[PDB]
Amino acid sequence: SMSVKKPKRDDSKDLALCSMILTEMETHEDAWPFLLPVNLKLVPGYKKVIKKPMDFSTIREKLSSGQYPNLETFALDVRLVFDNCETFNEDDSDIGRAGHNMRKYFEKKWTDTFK
Template identity: 35%
Template sequence: MDLRTMLNKLKNHQYDSPTEIRDDARLMFTNCRTYNEDGSDIFECATRLEAFMEERFAHAFGENGRKRRTL
């Protein structure tokens, strides 16, 4: 998974729920760390962006996973 694929899925209305977007974002970060060396710029940027997005997801979804407000 990558950002371009996610953007294309958004444009083509291929997501049925916000949780699908969240799941694809998490997969993207996992892939980024898997295919880039620990300590590399890309690895570190992915780690920081993931922390930011997880904070936003927590505010948007709450503890039970249901959407509370827009990102």
């Protein structure tokens, strides 16, 4: 509350560390469904159904331009990529499996870097 604060966690490295995580997600072999925005002209249903599209290149641009206020808003966009994927793709599909795999890979790096 006013004039009452928990001890200050060092957040000076968070930007660099989120960039590293994102590099690792970008270079994963199952990243291909997520590298670029879904083409809303060429994929019927996507625009109407997925209210907030998100992809790794859009996260990279937001990160590089100071549009993440903190590490949690960064994790929310990464998770949005996978939540979108599950909303639109059957579990038993190449893309549906890719999304589960990448969400696992992410959540481990996240815990190991920050928790």
